[PDB]
Amino acid sequence: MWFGEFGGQYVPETLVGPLKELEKAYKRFKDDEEFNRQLNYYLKTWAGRPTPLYYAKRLTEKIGGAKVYLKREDLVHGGAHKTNNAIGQALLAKLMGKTRLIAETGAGQHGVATAMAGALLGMKVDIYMGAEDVERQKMNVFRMKLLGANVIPVNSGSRTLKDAINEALRDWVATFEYTHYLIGSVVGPHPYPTIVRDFQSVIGREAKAQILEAEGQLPDVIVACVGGGSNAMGIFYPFVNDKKVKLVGVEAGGKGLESGKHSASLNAGQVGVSEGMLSYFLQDEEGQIKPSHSIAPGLDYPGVGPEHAYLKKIQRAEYVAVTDEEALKAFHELSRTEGIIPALESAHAVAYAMKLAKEMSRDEIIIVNLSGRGDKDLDIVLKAS
Amino acid sequence: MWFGEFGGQYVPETLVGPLKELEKAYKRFKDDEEFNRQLNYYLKTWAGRPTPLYYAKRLTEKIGGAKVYLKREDLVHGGAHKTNNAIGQALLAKLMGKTRLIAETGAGQHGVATAMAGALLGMKVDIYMGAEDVERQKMNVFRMKLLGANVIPVNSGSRTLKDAINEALRDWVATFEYTHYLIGSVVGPHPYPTIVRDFQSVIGREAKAQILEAEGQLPDVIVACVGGGSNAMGIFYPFVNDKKVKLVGVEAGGKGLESGKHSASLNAGQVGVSEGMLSYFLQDEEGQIKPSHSIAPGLDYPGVGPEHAYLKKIQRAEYVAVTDEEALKAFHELSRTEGIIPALESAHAVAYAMKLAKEMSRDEIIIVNLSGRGDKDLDIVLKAS
Ligand SMILES: N[C@@H](Cc1c[nH]c2ccccc12)C(=O)O
Ligand code: NA
Ligand code: NA
């Protein structure tokens, strides 16, 4: 419920009941033998876990500083960390006796992850999507249909994510008995931020074994991009009780923090209650929540996860930002130098890691979370160049 | 050089020296401890090998016959089996003392795999693509550009694959001193058929181990799509001396075997010399090379590898055809039932495995080679729908 001062269940009473039933179910299963047999089985044979830790010999040498390892979540089925959470929640839903999954997306990336997992486990999938976002993302709409998901287009309101979240939360309230609401990131009302981190913490447990195998010591610094902060919490959480290990989140700097068009909640954001949780959001002079901007659609969220806010206060994790032009720089450089086309989201985490590598010694170690592959971001990089 | 009565080195005197150099270098490195350590290292940390063996429960249960396992080559870095051979030959070329890679691509897949391998190993990469293909494949061209390769667009002749192969031979004859020619299937003069199969046999080695751990016994049938036959030779070769393991290759049935618009060289082809090898090719009344057809670009090749001609003559493998229609259903059915979007190439193997499974016992095992993921084929299945 509470990561220090941040978190909670700040929702209407009609949602409070379901969330308690989810809370009760998650407790029963999260340590159950058969739930973890099934989950680990699918994560292995379907998703292709474990994912490798890659030493970037060329990139490390070009910089001349600390050794740069890349945790390759780009190689997971679907091409993003998002799959670990979708399988977990979709399986939990199946054992809870649910027959249907709902989710929300504008990009399409989380609906595809939700669709894939629904099809795996033989559940119905309805994905609420704004009619504006549908036109702009026709291939992810087609993917979802190919996967047997129903995309319900939302012509009510601004026809965007906001209205799709409203139409979706409306559905869950009614249908919770048989339907599960699969949340993308470590955001929203408890218990969602806890469950999503628990299903993404496989990244760090693997990274830990793999860096101790590769180098015979824990890493000096771990870098991860932060939209809502599922992948960062994934690769952070198991290294939390290792004081030596510095955790760095990279938010979207956008055009610049002084410019207004950014998504850096933990930098220039203010404490509020939105979308079920108490955390940092982006706000103007008045109390209103402002639009966010990032060239990476994944980092384009005004909010940040409550656990990341908690980690920023106690100074266990620093939180920095990277410009769109710096991210595109690192997108091109990793492609040329490692033959790995990263996600624009992961391009941010890369961009900083190269800066931090120069300043550190060749004996030292940087692990960078490569959250996904950039096949989905090829159009955006073309237009930008 | 010869697989029974098939294979050879049908090339000009100008290419005998380069190929002899390659064969001698290959003899030297193929069993070298360091080459194999370095190759296995790139395959693990960069490609994400091993790939899982996935039991398709819902598909298996829907047909009501044999267990259907998918070998998940779709999960390898780059999204196809082609990566295995691309790393292999690039690492061979580097340790030979070559500084440059040249390749022919039509569809662009082998171009991207060569470009990726190039970046990894820090070698120059010039890819020869028909200028007509460059217009059709904007993403793959941009991908190769990002990955630090030059696409050398070829404007001479038909502006197609044939003309790119010739100007890539012309290139090699001159530059072979510092250049390796990276062939992307088990075709062309010796020693290419041997080398490409050696670098793809990792697929079968992993699959033998995985099905023995999983089921405690060898598969009853192994099914792979056959264009040139590299992914097929790859999963077949380790099982050849296992007499009770049936091998089935699935060529492109196209619009139908009686239509004359297909790529089923082994079913409806004649023995003769083309592209430097004695194998089966599609021939007209004259005996000149007939154009081929498949909805899957990777199967759209009038010829087939000499080792597949050999396995057919000794009746060790059975070779069948699946139509564009049957593959399309396969593409849709797997996406909906297992949440895996296969390549149109691999959808041929899935299509035939589903037919075979219905006829067989629930206790019997089929391994299908899922050679790639269907992201690249989404435009063509949308047009078809
Ligand atoms: N996808 C590859 C397929 C390919 C390359 N070389 C081949 C030789 C034989 C058969 C198929 C191929 C391409 O770019 O076209
Ligand atoms: Na944010
Ligand atoms: Na063929």
Q: What is the 3-state secondary structure (H, E, C) of chain B?
A: CEECCEECCCCCHHHHHHHHHHHHHHHHHHCCHHHHHHHHHHHHHCCCCCCCEEECHHHHHHHCCCEEEEEEHHHCCCCECHHHHHHHHHHHHHHHCCCEEEEEECCCHHHHHHHHHHHHHCCEEEEEEEHHHHHHCHHHHHHHHHCCCEEEEECCCCCCHHHHHHHHHHHHHHHCCCEEECCCCCCCCCCHHHHHHHHHCHHHHHHHHHHHHHHCCCCCEEEEECCCCHHHHHHHHHHCCCCCCEEEEEEEEECECCCCECCCHHHHCEEEEECCEEEEECECCCCCECCCCCCCHHHCCCECCHHHHHHHHCCCEEEEEEEHHHHHHHHHHHHHHHCCCECHHHHHHHHHHHHHHHHCCCCCEEEEEECEEHHHHHHHHHHHC
Cα-based angle A188, A320, A107 (whole degrees, multiple of 5):
45
Tell me which chain A residue has its CA closest to the CA of residue B211.
Answer: A45
Inter-CA distances, A235 with A230, B29, B60, Å? 9, 39, 36
Q: Are residues A211 and A88 in the same domain?
A: no
Distance CA B167, CA A76 (A): 38
Expressed in angstroms and rounded, the spacing between residue B324 Cα and the centre of ligand 3 is 14
Q: Which residues of B217-253 are buried (b: 16+ CB within 10 A; e: fewer)?
A: ebbbbbbbbbbbbbbbbbbbbbbbeeeebbbbbbbbb
CA-nearest of B269, B248, B270 to B322 is B248
Q: Are residues A118 and A246 in the same domain?
A: no
CB–CB of B327/B295 below 8 Å?
A: yes
Distance CA A227, CA A186 (A): 10
Closest residue to atom 4 of ligand 1, CA basis:
B184
Distance of CA A325 to the CA centre of its chain: 22
Residue found by looking up tokens 């706000």 in the block: A283
Inter-CA distances, A307 with A187, A200, A316, Å? 9, 14, 11
CB–CB of B230/B185 below 8 Å?
A: yes
Indicate the DSSP class of residue A151. Answer: E
CA-nearest of B332, B194, B253 to A145 is B332
Q: Are residues B320 and B376 in the same domain?
A: yes
Distance CA B300, CA B74 (A): 19
Q: Are residues B63 and B120 in the same domain?
A: no
Distance CA A271, CA A5 (A): 10
Cβ-based neighbours of B259, under 8 Å, separated by 6 or more: none
Q: What token pair was written down for A303?
A: 């909010």
Q: Structural domain of residue B337, as residue ranges?
A: 48-80+201-384
Q: What token pair was written down for B197?
A: 């199969």
Expressed in angstroms and rounded, the spacing between residue B106 Cα and the centre of ligand 1 is 7
Side chain identity at residue B240, one-letter code: V
Side chain identity at residue A61, one-letter code: E
CB–CB of B257/B250 below 8 Å?
A: no
Helix, strand, or coil (residue A378): helix
Residues β-bridged to residue A248:
A223, A318
Dihedral of CA atoms B205, B208, B211, B213 in degrees, nearest 10, equals -80
Whether A183 is in a domain gets the answer yes
Q: Which of B341, B368, B376, B380 to mutate to test the interface with A (most CBs of A within 10 A)?
A: B341
Give the sign of the dihedral formed by CA A346, CA A348, CA A350, CA A352. Answer: negative
Is B38 near chain A, with CB under 8 Å?
no
Residues β-bridged to residue A70:
A54, A368
Residues of chain A with C-beta less than 8 angstroms from the C-beta of B61: none
Side chain identity at residue B324, one-letter code: D
Cross-chain residue pair B381–A143, CB shorter than 8 Å: no
Catalytic residues of B: 82, 104, 371
Whether A3 is in a domain gets the answer no
Residue found by looking up tokens 């006796």 in the block: A97
Residues of chain A with C-beta less than 8 angstroms from the C-beta of B340: 77
Kindly write down the DSSP assignment for every residue of A256-290, as one continuous string: -TTTS----HHHH-EEEEETEEEEEE-B-SSSPBP
Cross-chain residue pair B45–A55, CB shorter than 8 Å: yes
Q: Please state the φ and ψ torsions of residue A245, each to the nearest 5 degrees.
A: -70, 110
Residues of chain B with C-beta less than 8 angstroms from the C-beta of A339: 46, 115-120, 147-148
Query: Is the link from the previous residue into B191 a cis peptide, with omega within 30 of 0?
Result: yes
Distance CA A302, CA A294 (A): 10
Q: Are residues B153 and B213 in the same domain?
A: no
Is B55 near chain A, with CB under 8 Å?
yes
Helix, strand, or coil (residue A365): strand
CB–CB of A250/A223 below 8 Å?
A: yes
A:212-241 residues touching chain B, CB 8 A cutoff: none
Q: Are residues A57 and A100 in the same domain?
A: no
Helix, strand, or coil (residue A249): strand
CB–CB of B206/B84 below 8 Å?
A: no
Resolution, in Å, please?
2.4
Distance CA B187, CA B189 (A): 7
Q: Are residues A94 and A243 in the same domain?
A: no
Dihedral of CA atoms A29, A30, A32, A37 in degrees, nearest 10, equals 110
Last residue of some domain: A133, A168, A196? A196
Residue found by looking up tokens 């009344």 in the block: B285
Whether A1 is in a domain gets the answer no
Is A334 near chain B, with CB under 8 Å?
no
Expressed in angstroms and rounded, the spacing between residue B253 Cα and the centre of ligand 3 is 10
Give the ligand at the shortest distance from the Cα of A282: 2
Cross-chain residue pair B146–A332, CB shorter than 8 Å: yes
CB–CB of B9/B190 below 8 Å?
A: yes
Give the sign of the dihedral formed by CA B69, CA B75, CA B78, CA B84. Answer: negative
Q: Are residues A24 and A149 in the same domain?
A: yes
**Radius of gyration of chain B measured on its C-alpha atoms:** 20
Q: How far is B381 from chain A (nearest CA, A)?
A: 10
Helix, strand, or coil (residue A94): helix
Please tell me the number of Cα atoms within 13 Å of B383 on its side-chain side: 5
CB–CB of B369/B346 below 8 Å?
A: yes
Side chain identity at residue B88, one-letter code: G
Query: Is the link from the previous residue into A191 a cis peptide, with omega within 30 of 0?
Result: yes
Residues within 5 Å of ion ligand 3, judged at the Cβ atom: B 263, 265, 301, 304
Q: Are residues B143 and B233 in the same domain?
A: no
CA-nearest of A169, A183, A78, A164 to A120 is A78
Enumerate residues lining ligand 1, CB below 6 A. B 105-111, 184-185, 187, 227-228, 298, 301
C-beta neighbour count of A385 within 10 angstroms: 11
Distance CA B360, CA A51 (A): 35
Inter-CA distances, A122 with A147, A148, A182, A308, Å? 11, 10, 15, 34
Last residue of some domain: B196, B215, B235? B196
Is A45 near chain B, with CB under 8 Å?
yes
CA-nearest of A151, A150, A147, A119 to A135 is A151
Helix, strand, or coil (residue A230): helix
| Largest separation between any pair of C-alpha atoms in chain B | 58
CA-nearest of A342, A338, A331 to A372 is A342
Residue found by looking up tokens 């989905």 in the block: A376
Distance CA A185, CA A167 (A): 19
Helix, strand, or coil (residue A48): coil
**Radius of gyration of chain A measured on its C-alpha atoms:** 20
CATH number of A87's domain:
3.40.50.1100
Distance CA B34, CA B38 (A): 6
Distance CA B199, CA B192 (A): 11
CB–CB of A204/A194 below 8 Å?
A: no
C-beta neighbour count of B162 within 10 angstroms: 15
A:62-121 residues touching chain B, CB 8 A cutoff: 72, 74-75, 77, 115-120
Q: Which residues of A310-332 are buried (b: 16+ CB within 10 A; e: fewer)?
A: bbbeeeebebbbbbbebbbbbbb
| Largest separation between any pair of C-alpha atoms in chain A | 58
Q: What token pair was written down for B88?
A: 């292999």
Residues β-bridged to residue A154:
A130
Last residue of some domain: A153, A176, A196? A196
Please tell me the number of Cα atoms within 13 Å of B195 on its side-chain side: 30
CA-nearest of A179, A163, A109, A170 to A377 is A109
Cross-chain residue pair B339–A44, CB shorter than 8 Å: no
Is B58 near chain A, with CB under 8 Å?
yes
Question: For chain A, how many structural domains are there in total?
Answer: 2
Phi-psi region of B165 (alpha: psi -120 to 50; beta: other; left: phi over 0): alpha
A:132-191 residues touching chain B, CB 8 A cutoff: 139, 142-143, 146-148
Q: Are residues A71 and A90 in the same domain?
A: no
Q: Which of B40, B43, B46 to mutate to test the interface with A (most CBs of A within 10 A)?
A: B46
Which own/partner pairs from B376-383 qualify as long-range (CB within 8 Å, at least 24 positions apart)?
A: B376/B79, B376/B107, B376/B109, B376/B140, B376/B343, B377/B296, B377/B331, B377/B343, B377/B344, B378/A139, B378/A142, B378/A143, B378/A146, B378/B341, B380/B295, B380/B344, B381/A146, B381/B328, B381/B331, B381/B332, B381/B344, B382/A142
Distance CA A353, CA A366 (A): 7
C-beta neighbour count of B105 within 10 angstroms: 27
| Ligand 1 pocket test, candidate residues B81, B82, B102, B104, most atoms within 8 A of CB | B104
CB–CB of A120/A91 below 8 Å?
A: no
Q: Are residues A160 and A263 in the same domain?
A: no
Helix (H) or strand (E) holding A126: strand A124-130
Q: Are residues A23 and A114 in the same domain?
A: yes
Closest residue to atom 1 of ligand 1, CA basis:
B109
Residue found by looking up tokens 């139409």 in the block: A167
- Write down the number of H helices and E strands in chain A: 16, 14
